[PDB]
Design a protein around this ligand. Structure first.
Ligand SMILES: CC(C)Nc1cc(-n2ncc3cc(C#N)cnc32)ncc1C(=O)NC[C@@H](F)C(C)(C)O
Length: 286
């Protein structure tokens, strides 16, 4: 299904895993908790090489998990796996490179990219939803839905990535994983449910409206989730939080997206809409 690489081929393609940023002529594109992503070229093909970095048996399990899911799931709103490398202690995953990186980076204008327009942010949300929907229809729960995991191609097509924590099929776990700033309350407890993915997507929709990261240690309030409490308790409005880095954001569509986000952000798992409803609401928005 996927091409098996030898770890040395990948050392060659990535200029021996150069840690300098791609903007400066290096190879580093970014990093998560489970690894660092590098740029490369395999047979004229631009690739993204995720070098897994830490426990070892859990990492191998997350590596095998990404491969199993990717083998089954192929969609226009999902990232594409070309191959991998499991030669010794180093575990690598090779993907089709995303010319526009992550939604997180584009929302912050990392490396001087222009701010995304409202129209583009809407199309991106619509893409992301179709991706979550395909995974859900295929009985998969992502477990790590966040803007760092919503990637963008040359046309700004949303592509869901990082399936190392993905699960099949409400169950429980002894190892709590994900990014706390996006995690549904039950997920923080240890519950595994597709409804948690809906909550995480609502945090993403708030990032899309505001241009603010879900968590910022140097910000009051540190958590973007707290901003919804301020709006709900009539102390502020969504208008006070609309990203100032855009000019084409009209209040009707902005409030319409906030409505979807607040429905997604229901405290109670069963009160949240399902993905097909989220898609319907987002399509209605435009
Ligand atoms: C690590 C992250 C944040 N950035 C990327 C990630 C990726 N890809 N592409 C596929 C892919 C899959 C995973 C996973 N799981 C992780 N990363 C992946 N491709 C590309 C970029 C990437 O930065 N392109 C560069 C782009 F942003 C530019 C030119 C404006 O500077």
């Amino acid at each position: 299904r996927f091409h098996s690489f030898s770890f040395y081929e990948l050392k060659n393609v990535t200029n021996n895993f150069d840690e300098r940023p791609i903007s400066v002529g290096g190879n580093k594109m970014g990093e998560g908790g489970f690894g660092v992503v590098y740029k490369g070229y395999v047979n004229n093909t631009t690739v993204a090489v995720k070098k897994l970095a830490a426990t070892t048996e859990e990492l191998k399990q997350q590596f095998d998990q990404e491969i199993k899911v990717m083998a089954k799931c192929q969609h226009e709103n999902l990232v594409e796996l070309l191959g991998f490398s499991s030669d010794g202690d180093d575990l690598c995953l090779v993907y089709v490179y995303m010319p526009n990186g992550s939604l997180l980076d584009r929302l912050s204008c990392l490396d001087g990219t222009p701010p995304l327009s409202w129209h583009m942010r809407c199309k991106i949300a619509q893409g992301a939803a179709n991706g979550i929907n395909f995974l859900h229809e295929n009985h998969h729960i992502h477990r790590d839905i966040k803007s760092a995991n919503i990637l963008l191609d040359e046309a700004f097509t949303a592509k869901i990535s990082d399936f190392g924590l993905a699960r099949a099929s409400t169950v429980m776990t002894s190892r709590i994983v994900g990014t706390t700033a996006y995690m549904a309350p039950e997920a923080l407890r240890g519950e595994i449910t597709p409804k948690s993915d809906i909550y995480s997507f609502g945090v993403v929709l708030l990032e899309i409206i505001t241009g603010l990261p879900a968590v910022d240690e140097h910000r009051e309030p540190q958590l973007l989730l707290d901003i919804k409490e301020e709006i709900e308790d009539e102390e502020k409005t969504i208008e006070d939080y609309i990203d100032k880095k855009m000019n084409d954001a009209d209040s009707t569509s902005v409030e319409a997206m906030y409505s979807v986000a607040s429905q997604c952000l229901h405290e109670k798992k069963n009160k949240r809409p399902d993905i097909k409803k989220v898609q319907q609401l987002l399509q209605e928005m435009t």
